[PDB]
Each structure stands twice: as C-alpha cells, then as structure tokens.
Amino acid sequence: TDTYPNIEALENAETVGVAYNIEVKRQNPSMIYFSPHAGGIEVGTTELIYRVVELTGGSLYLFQGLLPSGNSRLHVTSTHFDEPMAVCMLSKHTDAVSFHGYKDDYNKNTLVGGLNTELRNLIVSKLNSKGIAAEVATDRFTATDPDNIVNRCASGKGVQLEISSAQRRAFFQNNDWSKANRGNVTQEFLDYAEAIKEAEAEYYGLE
Amino acid sequence: TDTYPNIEALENAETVGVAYNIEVKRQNPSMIYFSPHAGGIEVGTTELIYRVVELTGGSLYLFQGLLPSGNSRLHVTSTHFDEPMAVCMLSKHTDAVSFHGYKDDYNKNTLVGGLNTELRNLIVSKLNSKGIAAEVATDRFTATDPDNIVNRCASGKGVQLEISSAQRRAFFQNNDWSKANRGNVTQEFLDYAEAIKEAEAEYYGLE
Numbered sequence: 001t002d003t004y005p006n007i008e009a010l011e012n013a014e015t016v017g018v019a020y021n022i023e024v025k026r027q028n029p030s031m032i033y034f035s036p037h038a039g040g041i042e043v044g045t046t047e048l049i050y051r052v053v054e055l056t057g058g059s060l061y062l063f064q065g066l067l068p069s070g071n072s073r074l075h076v077t078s079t080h081f082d083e084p085m086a087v088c089m090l091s092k093h094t095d096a097v098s099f100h101g102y103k104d105d106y107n108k109n110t111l112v113g114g115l116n117t118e119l120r121n122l123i124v125s126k127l128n129s130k131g132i133a134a135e136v137a138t139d140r141f142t143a144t145d146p147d148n149i150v151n152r153c154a155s156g157k158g159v160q161l162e163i164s165s166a167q168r169r170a171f172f173q174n175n176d177w178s179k180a181n182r183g184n185v186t187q188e189f190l191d192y193a194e195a196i197k198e199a200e201a202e203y204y205g206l207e
Numbered sequence: 208t209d210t211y212p213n214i215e216a217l218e219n220a221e222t223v224g225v226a227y228n229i230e231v232k233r234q235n236p237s238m239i240y241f242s243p244h245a246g247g248i249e250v251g252t253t254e255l256i257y258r259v260v261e262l263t264g265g266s267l268y269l270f271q272g273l274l275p276s277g278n279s280r281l282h283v284t285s286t287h288f289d290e291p292m293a294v295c296m297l298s299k300h301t302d303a304v305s306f307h308g309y310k311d312d313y314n315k316n317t318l319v320g321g322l323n324t325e326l327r328n329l330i331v332s333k334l335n336s337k338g339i340a341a342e343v344a345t346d347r348f349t350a351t352d353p354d355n356i357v358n359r360c361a362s363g364k365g366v367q368l369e370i371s372s373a374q375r376r377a378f379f380q381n382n383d384w385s386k387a388n389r390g391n392v393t394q395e396f397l398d399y400a401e402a403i404k405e406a407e408a409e410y411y412g413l414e
C-alpha cells in the first residue's frame with residue numbers, strides 16, 4: 001500500500017526537485033499522454049511518453065520520482081492521484097492515455113484498460129501488429145471507475161496502459177533500465193511508441 | 208489594450224498548440240523563472256528562461272505565443288494574468304522572477320522592478336558587472352502592484368525584468384531574432400543569463 005494517501009500529504013513531506021519533479025506541456029486540445037508514476041517510480045514511463053509526444057504532438061504531463069532508489073514511496077495510486085496541475089490538465093483534454101509500470105520481470109506484457117473502449121481496443125490491436133504482447137485488462141488494472149485519473153479527462157473516458165517490468169526493461173539497450181542508460185533505447189521501444197501514435201491516428205480518423 | 212481581459216477569455220477563443228502552449232517544470236521549492244509573454248509574444252523570453260533555468264535548477268513556467276504573426280493578441284497584462292497552472296506554480300515557490308520584453312529598437316536596457324527589492328538590486332548589479340545596461344525601474348515597470356503575477360509567489364514579493372527589444376535582438380546572432388535563428392545565441396545572451404544565476408546564488412547565501 002502507498003505511503004501518502006494523496007499528493008498533498010506527499011508534497012507536504014517530500015522536497016520538490018530532490019525527491020520529485022513535475023513536467024507539463026499543454027499543446028493539444030484533444031489528447032494528453034501522461035504518467036503519475038514517472039521518472040524512477042515506474043521506470044520507462046517518462047521515456048515512452050516523451051517519444052509518444054514527439055510522435056503525436058499530444059500534450060504531456062509527468063509526475064516524476066528523482067530518488068536514486070526507493071521512489072515507490074512517491075507512489076500514489078491513480079484512483080487517489082490528485083496533483084492539482086494534473087487534474088487541471090486532464091479536464092482541459094477530451095482524451096487521455098496514461099502510462100504505468102507493473103511488476104513482472106518474467107513476462108513481457110501490456111494490460112490495457114480504461115473507459116475509452118474504442119481507443120483501448122485500438123492500442124491493443126496496434127501493439128500486437130508490431131509483435132508486442134498486449135491484451136484487454138481483466139482481473140486487475142481494468143480502470144473502469146470514475147476516480148482513476150485517466151478517466152478524469154473531459155470525455156470522462158481514458159485509456160490506461162500497465163506495462164510489465166520485463167517489457168519496460170526490453171525498451172532499453174542491454175535490457176538495462178539504469179538511469180544512466182535510459183537514453184539508449186531498443187527497436188521494441190520505437191515500435192511500441194509508434195503503435196500508440198497509429199492507434200491515436202485511426203481513432204481520430206474514425207471519429 | 209489587450210485583446211482579452213484575462214486568460215480564461217483567451218482560452219475560450221484560442222486553440223492550444225496552434226495559437227499558444229504552456230510549458231511547466233516544477234523542480235525547486237524556492238525559485239521560479241517564468242514569463243506570461245513567452246515564445247512570440249515578447250520574443251527572446253523563452254530562450255532566456257531556458258538558459259537561466261539550466262544554470263540554476265529553478266522551476267520553469269512559459270506561456271508561449273506560437274503564431275507566425277500577430278502574437279500581440281495573446282498578451283494578457285501581468286496584473287490580469289491568471290492562467291491557473293501559473294497561479295498554482297507561483298503559490299508553491301518562495302520567490303519569483305519574471306521576464307518581459309518591451310519595445311525599444313534603439314537602446315539596450317533592462318528595467319528591473321518588483322516587490323523583492325533585494326534580489327532586484329542584485330540583478331541590476333550583476334547585470335551591470337557583465338557590461339549590460341540595467342537599472343531599477345522608477346517611471347514605468349516598477350511591478351509593485353500585488354496583482355502583478357510575479358508578486359503572487361508565496362512571499363508575495365517578486366522581481367520583474369523588462370528588457371528592451373534592442374537588448375533581446377542582441378541575444379541572437381546577426382542581431383536576428385526571427386524564430387528560425389533563435390537557437391543561435393550570442394555571448395551577451397550567455398552573460399545575461401549568467402548574471403541572473405549569480406544574483407540568485409548571492410541572494411540565498413543570505414538566508
């Protein structure tokens with residue numbers, strides 16, 4: 001379970017620019033790619049969001065852990081995640097795609113949920129077509145509730161990706177996710193990020 | 208006389224990512240460098256704050272004009288500027304320094320104002336030591352109005368820099384401030400940003 005019940009409690013106790021930073025680029029009316037668990041909290045979300053944003057021109061938001069270790073204490077689950085700038089950003093966008101990391105060093109997989117079923121299905125379908133393991137979330141991580149930060153975009157229907165630790169390790173050269181090496185990404189990384197852009201494209205193409 | 212009375216009015220008329228964007232990086236609990244008039248509104252404030260932020264580790268906020276032409280319509284005067292993320296940012300930083308541009312194509316000068324009299328005086332001194340024209344504003348740009356966005360930091364005391372067009376042109380090679388050229392900066396540019404870091408550094412050494 002979390003250390004902080006929400007982000008106020010977190011902010012009250014932690015020092016900004018030492019344990020955590022926040023990054024925002026609002027540059028799109030329609031779509032925002034973001035993570036509440038970026039930097040060291042869930043490793044690889046920052047870099048994947050950067051690439052997806054660089055590919056799409058989507059807006060960006062990242063609440064980032066900066067500690068060399070033990071960023072898990074900076075984890076506030078998405079249903080409780082209330083950083084005010086995040087909430088302001090979400091409300092200013094029709095759509096939202098969130099990026100998460102879950103522990104499974106033994107299987108490469110992505111579990112996609114959220115209330116935006118159409119974009120949810122599309123991302124699933126693009127990842128697969130790049131040979132990247134992906135399925136609709138079921139026991140866990142389904143995110144069909146109205147609290148999950150991702151469904152608090154304007155449409156009230158977001159898409160959550162929960163990416164296994166094995167998979168995120170395979171984004172980086174040498175399967176090594178050390179900070180020093182997070183600039184060195186693999187072909188799978190690139191394909192993953194392109195899959196997201198394609199799915200966003202068709203979505204806005206169907207609509 | 209501003210096209211819009213406040214940021215809500217602008218936002219209800221403009222498209223983000225076409226007319227305007229907002230960039231935020233919260234990474235210091237004491238100091239934020241920012242501009243309500245960045246990108247093409249007051250040209251050169253974006254580039255200066257990038258450099259000052261890189262030198263200092265201070266937090267960043269930019270409200271950027273993006274249009275090729277007529278960025279003037281996106282200028283919302285400091286005392287009216289209430290973009291809520293900027294308002295949020297300022298509230299959580301002890302101190303703040305804002306970068307503005309004013310039109311004077313023939314003189315290099317910076318007019319320094321704000322309720323933070325100590326940091327203001329340091330900035331003028333450090334600017335002057337680099338052979339850069341700067342003085343305490345007295346007849347305009349005094350920035351003592353508690354409504355001016357820069358004074359809405361948690362101390363309620365900010366520092367404002369009003370920098371002449373001639374000065375900002377001089378930040379760029381061939382004195383050319385056309386957007387294509389804005390990554391090509393001068394030595395005077397480097398000096399100017401270096402002065403601000405020395406001011407800040409000298410400042411906190413007090414407390």
Ligand SMILES: [Zn+2]
Nearest residue numbers: 037042100101
């Ligand atoms: Zn997460």
Ligand SMILES: [Zn+2]
Nearest residue numbers: 244249307308
């Ligand atoms: Zn201005």
